[PDB]
RNA sequence: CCGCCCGUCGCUAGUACCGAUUGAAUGGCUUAGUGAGGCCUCAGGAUCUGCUUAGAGAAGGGGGCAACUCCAUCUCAGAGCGGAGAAUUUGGACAAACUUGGUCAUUUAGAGGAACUAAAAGUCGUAACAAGGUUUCCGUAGGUGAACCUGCGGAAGGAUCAU
RNA sequence: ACCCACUCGGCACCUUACGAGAAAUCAAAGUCUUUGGGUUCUGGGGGGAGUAUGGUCGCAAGGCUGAAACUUAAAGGAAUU
RNA sequence: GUCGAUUUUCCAACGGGGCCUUUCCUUCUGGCUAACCUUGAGUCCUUGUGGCUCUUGGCGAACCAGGACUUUUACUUUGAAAAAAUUAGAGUGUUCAAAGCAGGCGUAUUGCUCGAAUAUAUUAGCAUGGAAUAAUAGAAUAGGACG
RNA sequence: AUCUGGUUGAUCCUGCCAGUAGUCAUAUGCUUGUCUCAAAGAUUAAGCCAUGCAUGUCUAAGUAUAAGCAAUUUAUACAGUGAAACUGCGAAUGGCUCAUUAAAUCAGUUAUCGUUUAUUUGAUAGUUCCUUUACUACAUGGUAUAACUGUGGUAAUUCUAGAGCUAAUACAUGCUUAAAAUCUCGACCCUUUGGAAGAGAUGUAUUUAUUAGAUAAAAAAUCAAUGUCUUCGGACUCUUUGAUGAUUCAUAAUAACUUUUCGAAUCGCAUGGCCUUGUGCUGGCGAUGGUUCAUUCAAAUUUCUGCCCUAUCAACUUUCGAUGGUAGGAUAGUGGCCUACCAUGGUUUCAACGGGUAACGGGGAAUAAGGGUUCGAUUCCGGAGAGGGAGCCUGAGAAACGGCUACCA
RNA sequence: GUAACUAUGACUCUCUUAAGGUAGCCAAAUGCCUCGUCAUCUAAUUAGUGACGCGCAUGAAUGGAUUAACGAGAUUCCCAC
């Protein structure tokens, strides 16, 4: 979602140990790994027959997902394949009976093989520490018009 | 914590020793073996408590240093080694052959054994792969690793160890209509039969276990040890077969004597 | 450092200490029995509070439950054995209304002035 | 040292943590002793558990595979030409993963030549193999140029600072469009 | 009601503030500059070295012509590396510590200045409580030994629940 | 149209009273130990003190926010003689 | 209804599943279908719609493990793992008690034997049943639904 | 589940002061006969410390000429017991304190398909010579020194200098392989249904590329690589594979690669078996050691949610990483952890950030209607520190302090 | 001149003609004594600064008190040199 490029950066943007052996006839001769996300995530059409990279992607790259399967509303789309969810919960206070909201941002990659803008509900998954903040991916979205 | 410890306070050790809260504040740290350290009982703890074989931890040295306390068999004569679950403590003098199994109540009970059946364990199959060579091996909860299993052992089976050669020889397959030991829930010493079992995917596949009073109680597959089939258990269950009798109808049997 | 002996303390000191009618029924349930201190009333008056604590817990909630059933039971058991309750009085709801001068009744020195051969209980 | 530690690192809120733990081993980081080319040197450092690991300095005669033909011959390093992260790891001639270089080219030539066609850059049971081989496969122009030039571009797929070697992966198809544009973009 | 009670002033003995002093001290962080030390690294090469069968004069240079009945036999031109290897030093990052200002926090000195409370009530009046002898009070403005006084607007908690 | 009688909706009210409040008293100050319709603001003995300090606003006068040390067994509300 | 320990109707109260009244848990491909909606010879048989050696055509609901899509939360039920010590509390004459987790009973010569329970941990996470209270969207330029 | 005294001439209130009870709270004052039990330099000064001690270790099973004691009825190489020293292992546990520390530690609960792991417990290693007719393997070197013997020095320290020796499971090297198959390279003749003499390589580990690691479902014409069976019209039939929700996983195969890791030049006790009497060949129980994979004790990060008082702290973070991307470096490994090159992000009235804490968190503690309030330095768990910062070696494990180095006091 | 007390803000009289220097400020470029006294700056300061004020003989457009910026103005101290 940079947009349209894949030769954009100074390094070649490959899929790591697929190899694209020249000297056979394959009609395409575009070959792309993918795998099964698991726990009923049907991966997207938009991911199987795309062209980009994104090695911490839960389809097309070295990151499994597992831990648990968090949802939230999103707040900022602003930063290059990374989203930030609020998640909104109440905490209740043992002495007055009652409830309070807390935010709770957390800031979630996302993937070329979905779409999203400002309001949209997405479910995310545990993987490997990505980055300094990013801990989850983005599996499912639901934009709700 | 700068390297790992080595000693552990009486009170913070596993209660299901018993281990009086006062005379000594260390407990018998158990070393490093086939169990893990909540779940083992020390060769320790079993000959100078369970048995009072032994009165102080210097007397249980002089029982094991003369090579008498065979564990699966071999010598073992480390005062804290971690003799756990399905292990056969053979006292050679006496010709004592206890198979520590749970007491109801969640506990190693002493369970004496004829010597035609201390010469197996029932290893609960944990992984199975191919090992390099592409040759397929098993590993047990005991940390006991077997070569060239059955094709059919998956895992959560069990199977029984000769324990003298150390091969597989019959394994039981992990189903409804099972019977089934619990390894430590707080369902801890129970013996009952499967009914069904969850598909819960990297959530803890749950399983639902009914005795022989239709007492249905749930937990966990890694806490379920498959002990046989209806009927014939593959190994002697202790005097109670693992019921988990209420606190009024086990009074009454306490006062009925 | 090995582990926390556990101790507890048996009696209680009354709330308000200067009451004519509480400092004359006192004196007069230790004259019976012949008793050194007040400490002795106030410890049976907390053993006392301490089962009508455990009889109210286990009165309060549902009839015919096993918690109510066993530690009822239990208490009564204990109770009729001691000889604060006799062979006609076990209901859990007697126990309520128990007068710490029965304890009273019930110490060794009472007991063998009551057996004879004792001469009045001092 | 050079500690990989996130609890300094000012918190994603923006709060200066307040440091606790006197640096600890555990997150160690080291010096990357930067490889030049040619001269063969190799320093071994003790990491977690004995468990060595070699860092090469001024390694030479790299172990490079074509993939395609499903080959690796040990061959000569010239030169670093260019490098998707810095590009004073080119001027300096450093080897370090993904470093885009020029190697020797002729025990590739040699195979090719013996092996399967005749003279790249232009007994009984040989002659057998060769007419079994029966045009097997040709090279798309691209790297045909090279090995007349007298060497072939190759990218470093070995971490040198940390196995001891500069192994791997010999350029071939759009990733070597991709390298050519680069390279004659620049100089 | 010979009840009550308000301020100035004076005596006392407490607390707080303003205060020139480039106040002072402690602490944290931080600018710019020196920067011990070990570690990584470019070198360096005191010494100790093994085969060097490497030409070596040496005439029991082995129980004596004898490539001695050749010795770690006389003695080095070498030589390679098989090498080990100290000080030394080349840059690197880690980084104490030093100086230098900065900024914030806490603690705290200060000649003087303007207060406030308390304490016997000592001086001066008698402001308030009655229509307290000018009804009281609020906001604001000015004046004055002190209470207070006066203007304007407001309020009854007014001494009028009335034409 | 003004006026008269009955009628509603809203208004500024007023006169008699079972509930409430320490009482004076009241259309809400009732539906409150038989304690919960929604919601904002404020107070915790009397002084010191609406004072000092620090910000903030203002041409200034001042306004907003606003302490503590220390002191004291009462100060105060309503009604009765 | 009986030998001061316990079950039957005449006969209720409480809490429930099936079944349709337009009511539908989305339902498939195999395995499994025990099975009669049926009969392959029928008939062991006091006159019997008394009873099965067993099986054409299809039941599915005994029965998954694969399909594979589910407009989302709070709330509450039950369960899972919740260290021990502490707390509540079961048992036991440490001479009593705070304690302790011991002890108990026989030939007390080779002995045997009950114990070291249970309960709360009302937050968060995990499964589980309910769907009353509270919010969210669904068909409005139909880019709506089903075959 | 309780109140009572105090404003008034008296009264009803608001209200505070005082009384009252308790405190695994502390101090202190008088008094103090017995039994059980038992905290105790935490607040102030994580301020300073004299001195003595708190970490060393041996079996039958590493090294022995102690110039030690054995000393007699196993000894002519050693062999008992038992110093010193080398070697191994430990010294990272324990104990102590609470200064720092306020999304930090911590609790409960998750994840390693993101890694290391001495030791323990399981498995696990015919492939190393290198061209094949007498090159160590019935056994290599000092390319080494301790302890010991002597010759010393400083006033001094757990100072060691020069010389004479001597061992190791120390330190260096360094061979003993069976069978079969698979691959490559070629000593072979005939225009074919076209096929081989031999030589080498193929253990494990490293590193990199390449391939395999399968799949909801029945029929069909056709051209070629057409190799056997042609039962000479034409038939070929059966063609294999584990685990997870999920992996580039386990695992295997091709090409290689490496200053080529490992494979037992080790020790104790019995001393048996067959005769070809070599004074052979074969052989048990053990002990260490050893490579990889499991296991165990661990570790390191790690998901979610929950911390006391302040607005007289409303904006904070970004040259000097702040948020993300690409690539690299580094790490045991993940990661702005660090580097380079890009984009301008990220937190916040649901209280960010700043300040305070006489704040280490928790299990818990005191009080007791219910609801709570206050506390927890302190017998267990975790975190931190060893006068203050920083650095680092040794090791599986430390940024160790009863280890070293430097700076400040 | 008297007066709480120990230095006096209440009284009383007579006014230099008309008024008695108010708000302010100062040993000031205006203070004789004077090198005033107290603090501060220095080891030491007839200097400097900040205060004190019965001010020989300060003072309100003969303007008084402040005052940013400016000054080849007069003066003091500090760092660099």
Redesign the pocket.
Known sequence: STELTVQS???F???????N?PKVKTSKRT?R?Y????????TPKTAIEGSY????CPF????????????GTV??????????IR??????I??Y?R?????????V?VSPAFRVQVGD?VTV????????????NVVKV?A?? | ????????????????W?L????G??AP???????????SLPLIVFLR??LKYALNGREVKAILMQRHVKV?G???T?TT??AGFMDVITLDATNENFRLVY?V???FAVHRITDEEASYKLGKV????????????V?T???????YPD?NI??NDTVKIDLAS?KITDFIKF?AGKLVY?T?????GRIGTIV?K?????????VHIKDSLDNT????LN?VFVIGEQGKPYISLP?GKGIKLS?AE??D??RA? | ??????????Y??????YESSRLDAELKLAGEFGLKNKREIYRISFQL??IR??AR?LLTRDEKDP?RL??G???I??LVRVGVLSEDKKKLDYVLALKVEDFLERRLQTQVYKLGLAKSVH | ???????????????????????????????????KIG?????????????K???????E?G?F????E?????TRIAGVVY???????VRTNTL????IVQIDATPFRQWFEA?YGQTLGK????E??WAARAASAKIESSVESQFSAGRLYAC??????????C???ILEGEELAFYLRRLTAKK
């Open positions: 950066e100074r390094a943007q490959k899929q790591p140990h697929i190899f052996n070959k790994w795998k099964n996300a698991g726990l009923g995530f049907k990279i994104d090695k911490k097309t790259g070295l990151v499994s997902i597992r831990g648990k399967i968090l949802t707040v900022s789309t602003k930063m290059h394949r990374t989203i930030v998640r909104a919960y109440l905490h209740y043992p002495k009976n409830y309070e909201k807390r935010h709770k941002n957390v800031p990659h509900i998954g545990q993987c490997r520490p990505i980055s300094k903040t990013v801990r989850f639901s709700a018009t | 914590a700068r390297g790992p410890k080595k000693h552990l306070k009486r009170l913070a050790a596993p209660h299901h018993l009086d809260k006062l005379s504040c260390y740290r158990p070393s490093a073996g086939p169990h893990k350290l909540r779940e408590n369970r699966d071999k010598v073992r480390d080694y971690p007491d109540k969640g506990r944990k992984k199975v792969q191919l090992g390099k060579k592409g040759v397929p091996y590993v909860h005991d940390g006991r690793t077997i070569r094709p998956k895992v150390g189903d619990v430590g829930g707080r369902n801890l069904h969850e598909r819960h995917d990297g959530g803890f596949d749950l109680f749930v937990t966990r806490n005097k606190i086990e009074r049997r306490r004597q | 450092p090995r582990a926390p002996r556990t101790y507890s303390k048996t209680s000191t009354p709330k308000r200490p509070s301490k604590r455990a817990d918690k066993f530690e039971n239990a208490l058991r204990r | 040292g050079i500690s990989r530690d996130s609890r300094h690192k000012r918190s994603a809120t923006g709060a200066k943590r307040a440091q606790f733990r006197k640096k600890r081993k555990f997150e160690l980081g080291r010096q990357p002793a930067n490889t001269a063969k040197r190799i320093h071994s450092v003790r990491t977690r558990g004995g468990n690991k070699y860092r090469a300095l001024r390694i005669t172990n595979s074509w993939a395609s499903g080959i690796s011959k040990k490098h998707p992260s810095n590009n004073e790891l370090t993963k993904a470093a092996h007994s009984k049971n040989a057998r193999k470093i797929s070995s971490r040198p600072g940390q196995s001891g070697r192994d791997g992966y």
